[PDB]
Design a protein around this ligand. Structure first.
Ligand SMILES: Nc1ncnc2c1ncn2[C@@H]1O[C@H](COP(=O)(O)OP(=O)(O)O)[C@@H](O)[C@H]1O
Ligand SMILES: Nc1ncnc2c1ncn2[C@@H]1O[C@H](COP(=O)(O)OP(=O)(O)O)[C@@H](O)[C@H]1O
Ligand SMILES: [Mg+2]
Ligand SMILES: [Mg+2]
Lengths: 118, 371, 160, 74, 371
């Protein structure tokens, strides 16, 4: 058992993890774009008469109200879920890491070699 | 920038920057004017030696503590002590550093308001905050519950805390502390022939108390043993020779803590005011307080106190509960370590009393939301 | 293998002060720099540095296996610098948890060993005595049949 | 039930506090611009909706992690 | 998908997915705000602990039930309880699950309408249905006739049913239940010296009642025996020690059920309101109701009640009829088991109050055909 490859292995694992994170971000963005296209259809603005624009914007406004309802719903959901996650994280820390927050220290530094100076 | 965690105390001023393990400068809080006439000219004789300088020239001074029992009785001397602490022991101007003083529970308001007014007007700090001396000692232990007995040198107070919610109706503050033990030791030493009277010799009696006295596990058995054998008589060399021999004065001086009737005080000892402080709490948090009894403060450093107190409480408490007494080796600086931890927290960074707030509401801001 | 090796190849004066202080403690001139691992640990504890005997005993079990008691400057400097905490705090705990949830596909409240093996073989590193079962030996603290992110930290915390 | 504030807020957001917009009362160019604004708003907001779903994913992950930790520790 | 069979109750909220044997999560329905000040910073102290979390921190909380007698008196707290039940004890979003609440008979309309309005607007369920708490307890027994006495913790009600046809004119609802027995026990414990006052200590008295009290077969003989011998005195250890000894308070607390004059209530006991509920029924179904008397609810779990009640009814009833009292071992969760069975039926699948129906008729839809 050598400490030699500990550094290399942890650096390689960090590189792999970073690649996974950036790839997951890119694929989430692509899926989001696809779901957006299939939800909000792409805007067509060709050869349209004014009445056609009126009707299309009316449909769009009805959809706007509907999606606003959906999204304020999911926004309240995400807010409540974030709050609950934070609360349970702090509870878990209290159960496990509350005894360790005081232990975070920067000690035994100056007084070690500051005794004979007097 | 970094915060200054000062801790006035009564007997030893402990200070240092936030985020370390131990206070940077610890020195007695005494200010002693010279009392004789002085004949050498140009010797550079000052008018008042403060701090650790007056513990070396104490032969010709009249030392007088500026803090009697938690409260501050002589504001000019306390201002002098603070000025010394900031400028000579730490060498950091206060114009660029927040300060975190500490105060005993149940102290007069005027003391706290004057303290904040001084810190904001004379030293002109950016922001200062005053904290109760027991919550810090609970921080340092890394707990979040427990009942802490902080037997300092001025005043002994016993603050119970559960889950971070302090119980204000269960604080039992008792004014017996290290200074009264020093006076009682100085009074019982006269039974062998040694008379200490001068305010300078009180320091010698304090050194005797620190180095020799210990708390007996059982008082009557020790009194009987010391009266028959001579295995207890420990000798000590005064600052000039003439060694002295302390007999059963060794465990009779700190016994006053558990029987305050020795110095004429009516109240019950530190072994029974803790049990009373627990019994005032609710019926469902008594087990946790029993299991997490915390000791702090200087005077709880007597060899053998963590066993005597546990025996006494186990005698008082119900037989089923487990009694555990937390006595960390870093007891003396426990309050200051806790103060450093509290000042180093990010969540606490917005609780300071900012100067503009003081300018708008006056010194009475300390009793307000910014506690 | 290479991090402290690179640092020594670019020997900095800040570490060089302590290095040469302990050197004059050890080498009085025109010497081979023997500095036995036992003596090296003795002085490392002696001169006010980190008094951790664990690294010293690791060296003693590891170094002076030559039978000459001499310690070459390369490994002695490597163990001196690695005795001090040379790490960038091992990234971020939340960030590393996200790294591991990308690593962990089961999401069964933990991660199993095989996912760790997959990530390790994805890293593409050489295998030595600290392989195969060293992770198994260290991570099997309570032997919960898994290698959680918390267990993975318990094994190799401070991943940089 | 003294969540009248909460559900009243819900109804207000869905009906009133939403961008309750008169849109079919505009010039041809003006109405076209407003329709473009509505379309862009829906697009960006539904991207945010996907983000919130992903946050639901992460929160569920952490919930499962906490459950396993609690079970193993107790 | 699967249906959520919630059961609000009063004292214990029981919930779980339809089609199982036992509720998934059972926890007291109490919401307790902290009452002390709180000095630790960053401890992560919440503003209200609900459910089973507030039965562990009850030492520094003020627990208050949001449901007094069947009816709901504090709608915000009830909404909080429901939110906790859905999200943390079951971890299933309500947007994808039908719900089946339960309600006591003869309750105010506004309570039921507000319940359905909350479930449809705040939690936004697909469809919810409200059922009477006694029909479910009759489902769980696998019967189709019988008169069920569902003595919960809030309210005791006695619904007779024959061949599936409920008799609405024979429902006798009485407001004596487990909570009043807890208060009466807490009031008679003071005759030995034990005083419980705090709302947290009501939980301790409830535990005493659950673990020690029993219903006497004959009251006067037990009162005479407990006053001469000492074979009844059972001891119990408080949450901090100091064991207590309960004498003839053991069978005097639950005796209030059969003599409501003890707590000053005028009405007749649960032994005589059942007979009155039977006698209001028609003359030809009284034999079947006599033979199929069903017990349910938590408070009917006292050791020895299924014999006392049978003896009393046999005394009241004509000598020829056979009196049988069905007391299944799974009494406490009988209502919820019946709820699961009802929600799992195919014939019932079209009785839910679909959301579009609520949108068309408002919350008053519940009183309509979809009952
Ligand atoms: N090692 C010791 N043994 C016994 N008593 C001590 C010891 N160290 C300090 N003391 C007593 O404690 C006092 C110092 O208490 P301290 O905690 O500094 O008070 P404060 O709370 O004001 O800081 C001294 O006056 C001394 O009497
Ligand atoms: N084993 C038991 N013995 C005696 N009484 C009990 C027992 N279990 C519960 N109880 C009483 O019943 C109550 C619970 O009744 P429960 O059926 O949960 O009411 P609800 O109908 O609101 O669900 C408790 O308050 C308690 O007083
Ligand atoms: Mg102190
Ligand atoms: Mg019920």
């Amino acid at each position: 058992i050598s400490a030699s490859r500990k550094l290399q292995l942890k650096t390689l694992m960090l590189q792999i993890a970073k690649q996974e994170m950036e790839r997951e971000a890119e694929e989430r963005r692509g899926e989001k774009g696809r779901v957006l296209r299939t939800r909000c259809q792409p805007l067509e603005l060709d050869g349209l008469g004014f009445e056609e624009l009126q009707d299309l914007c009316r449909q769009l406004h009805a959809r706007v109200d509907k999606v606003d309802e959906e999204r304020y719903d999911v926004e309240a959901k995400v807010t409540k879920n974030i709050t609950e996650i934070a609360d349970l994280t702090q509870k878990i820390y209290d159960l496990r890491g509350k005894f360790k927050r005081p232990t975070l220290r920067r000690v035994r530094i100056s007084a070690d070699a500051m005794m004979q100076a007097l | 920038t970094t915060a200054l965690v000062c801790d006035n105390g009564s007997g030893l001023v402990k200070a240092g920057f936030a985020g370390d393990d131990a206070p940077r400068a610890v020195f007695p809080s005494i200010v002693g004017r010279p009392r004789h006439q002085g004949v050498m000219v140009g010797m550079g004789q000052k008018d008042s030696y403060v701090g650790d300088e007056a513990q070396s020239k104490r032969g010709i001074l009249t030392l007088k503590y500026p803090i009697e029992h938690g409260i501050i009785t002589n504001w000019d001397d306390m201002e002098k002590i603070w000025h010394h602490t900031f400028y000579n022991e730490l060498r950091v101007a206060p114009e660029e550093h927040p300060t975190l003083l500490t105060e005993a529970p149940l102290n007069p308001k005027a003391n706290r308001e004057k303290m904040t007014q001084i810190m904001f007007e004379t030293f002109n700090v950016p922001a200062m905050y005053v904290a109760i001396q027991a919550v810090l000692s609970l921080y340092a232990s890394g707990r979040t519950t427990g009942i802490v007995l902080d037997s300092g040198d001025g005043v002994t107070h016993n603050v119970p805390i559960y889950e971070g919610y302090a119980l204000p109706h269960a604080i039992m503050r008792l004014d017996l502390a290290g200074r009264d033990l020093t006076d009682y030791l100085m009074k019982i030493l006269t039974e062998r022939g040694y008379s200490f009277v001068t305010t300078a010799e009180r320091e010698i009696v304090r050194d005797i108390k620190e180095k020799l006295c210990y708390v007996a596990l059982d008082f009557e058995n020790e009194m009987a043993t010391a009266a028959s054998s001579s295995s207890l008589e420990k000798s000590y060399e005064l600052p000039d020779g003439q060694v002295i021999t302390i007999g059963n004065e060794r465990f009779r001086c700190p016994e006053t803590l558990f029987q305050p009737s020795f110095i004429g005080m009516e109240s019950a000892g530190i072994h029974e005011t803790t049990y009373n402080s627990i019994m005032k709490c609710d019926i469902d948090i008594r087990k946790d307080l029993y299991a997490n009894n915390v000791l702090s403060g200087g005077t709880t450093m007597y060899p053998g106190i963590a066993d005597r107190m546990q025996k006494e409480i186990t005698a008082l408490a119900p037989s089923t509960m487990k009694i555990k007494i937390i006595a960390p080796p870093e007891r003396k600086y426990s309050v200051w370590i806790g103060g450093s931890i509290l000042a180093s927290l990010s969540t606490f960074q917005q609780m300071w009393i900012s100067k503009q707030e003081y300018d708008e509401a006056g010194p009475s801001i300390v009793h307000r939301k910014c506690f | 293998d290479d991090i402290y090796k690179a640092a020594v190849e670019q020997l900095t004066e800040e570490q060089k002060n302590e290095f040469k202080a302990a050197f004059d403690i050890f080498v009085l001139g025109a010497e081979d720099g023997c500095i036995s691992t036992k003596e090296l640990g003795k002085v490392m504890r002696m001169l006010g540095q980190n008094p951790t005997p664990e690294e010293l005993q690791e060296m003693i079990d590891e170094v002076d296996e030559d039978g000459s008691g001499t310690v070459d400057f390369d490994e002695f400097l490597v163990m001196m610098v690695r005795c001090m905490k040379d790490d960038s705090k091992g990234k971020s705990e939340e960030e590393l948890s996200d790294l591991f949830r990308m690593f962990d596909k089961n999401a069964d409240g933990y991660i199993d060993l095989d996912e760790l093996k997959m990530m390790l073989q994805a890293t593409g590193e050489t295998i030595t005595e600290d392989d195969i079962e060293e992770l198994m030996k260290d991570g099997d603290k309570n032997n919960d049949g898994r290698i959680d992110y918390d267990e993975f930290l318990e094994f190799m915390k401070g991943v940089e | 039930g003294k969540r009248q504030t909460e559900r009243e807020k819900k109804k207000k957001i869905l009906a009133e506090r939403r961008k309750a917009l008169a849109i079919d009362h505009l010039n041809e160019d003006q109405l076209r611009e407003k329709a473009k604004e509505l379309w862009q708003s829906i697009h960006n907001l539904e991207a945010e909706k996907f983000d919130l779903q992903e946050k639901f994913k992460q929160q569920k992950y952490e919930i499962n992690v906490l459950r396993n930790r609690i079970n193993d520790n107790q």
